[PDB]
Amino acid sequence: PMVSLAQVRGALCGALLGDCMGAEFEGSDAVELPDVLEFVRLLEKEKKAGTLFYTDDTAMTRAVIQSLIAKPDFDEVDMAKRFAEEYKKEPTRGYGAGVVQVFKKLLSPKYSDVFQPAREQFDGKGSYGNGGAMRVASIALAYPNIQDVIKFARRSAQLTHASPLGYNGAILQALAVHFALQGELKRDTFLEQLIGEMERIEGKLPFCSRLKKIKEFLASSNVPKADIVDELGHGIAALESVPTAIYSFLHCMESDPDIPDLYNNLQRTIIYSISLGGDTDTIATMAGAIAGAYYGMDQVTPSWKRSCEAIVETEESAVKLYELYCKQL
Ligand SMILES: Nc1ncnc2c1ncn2[C@@H]1O[C@H](COP(=O)(O)OP(=O)(O)OC[C@H]2NC[C@H](O)[C@@H]2O)[C@@H](O)[C@H]1O
Ligand SMILES: [Mg+2]
Ligand SMILES: [Mg+2]
């Protein structure tokens, strides 16, 4: 039953792998599995370590983690500051065009309410992008109690994503990591857990409807990529990416006929995610966090992880997150 350091480290390294490997295909909407498999074989043979750079997905993840470690009770003012200073330090990591404005406003002296800049986005409608969700995994790694996971997922997201689609996408991604982490649930129970929580939270019900489609897809075999993309999405919008990440994870619990069986489940998850195209760094970073939490560090292979920028720092950070988790027990 008990959550291991291997699982927490697995989640963070999974997220990092997904971001670093997915970034290599970002925004190319048609990705063919053969290119992904070619990329992985080349990657495994690279003599130099650290050839793949992380993006805003990981930059913001690291800022979430530093906030949780500094303020374990969750301090949204501290976290807002870390987001804004990280942006300022490394503004070219690949941030969305909208969210840049949130950081500039948080960096100015005009706002005392750290949630107000996010509220003002897109004529006061707020962002429905997946940026809240891309960084949220660590909430589930720090807070064992589901009510904490839900409220802190929401609040962390609302620093940049004030639209319900934005922040509910973050909650869903946090819940997926939460349920992956706490046991090795069977597929059907995992989805039931998520659908149950999102029905309460949303309750026409956009995320629930996608989770229902996922249930249907998993009851079929040989579902073409095109049907997954058409019905779930591969977009920058949280609605069109978070369920897709969850599907990738659940799908890759079993053999995929197109992916050689010599790849483990976590590797398969990342390969499959990227093969869906679109927002590949974010979909893979989210699917990789879930898979990492589920399968743990045993499936984070040396040849894959050595390729990623900040792998050592990431592995270290897991220990400090794990301490947060254990204190909360
Ligand atoms: N309400 C609304 N209306 C119209 N367009 C929107 C809206 N919300 C988001 N968007 C579009 O989504 C884009 C991204 O949203 P934003 O809030 O700027 O960024 P995120 O943090 O969600 O983006 C995360 C993504 N960017 C790089 C990352 O790896 C993720 O793919 C933004 O520039 C717009 O084109
Ligand atoms: Mg990115
Ligand atoms: Mg992205």
Numbering used by the authors: 8 to 210, 228 to 353
Verbatim from the authors:
Protein ADP-ribosylation is a highly dynamic post-translational modification. The rapid turnover is achieved, among others, by ADP-(ribosyl)hydrolases (ARHs), an ancient family of enzymes that reverses this modification. Reversal of the bulk of PAR modification is mediated by poly(ADP-ribosyl)glycohydrolase (PARG) converting the polymer chain to a mono(ADP-ribosyl) (MAR) modification (Lin et al., 1997, Slade et al., 2011).
In order to probe whether the differences between the active sites have an effect on substrate recognition, we used the ADPr analogues adenosine diphosphate (hydroxymethyl)pyrrolidinediol (ADP-HPD) and -monoalcohol (ADP-HPM). These compounds were originally designed as PARG inhibitors and contain pyrrolidine instead of the distal ribose as well as differing in the number of hydroxyl substituents. In order to elucidate further the selectivity of these inhibitors, we performed crystallization experiments with hARH1 and LchARH3 in the presence of these ligands and solved the structures of the hARH1:ADP-HPM, LchARH3:ADP-HPD, and LchARH3:ADP-HPM complexes. In contrast, the orientation of ADP-HPD in the active site is similar to ADPr. The only differences are that the 2″ OH moiety of ADP-HPD is bridging MgI and MgII and a flip of C5″ rotates the pyrrolidine ring slightly away from the Mg2+ ions allowing for a more relaxed conformation. However, the 1″ OH in the LchARH3:ADPr complex appears to take part in the second coordination sphere of MgII, whereas this is not the case in the hARH1:ADPr complex. In the latter, the ADPr takes on a more relaxed conformation, which is mimicked in the LchARH3:Arg-ADPr and :ADP-HPD complexes, thus suggesting that an α-linked oxygen draws the ribose ring closer to the magnesium ion. In our structures, this moiety is either coordinating MgI (ADPr structure) or bridging between the Mg2+ ions (ADP-HPD, Arg-ADPr, and IDPr). In line with the previous results, hARH3 is most efficiently inhibited by ADP-HPD and to a lesser extent by ADPr and ADP-HPM (IC50 of 0.587 μM, 3.2 μM, and 480 μM, respectively).
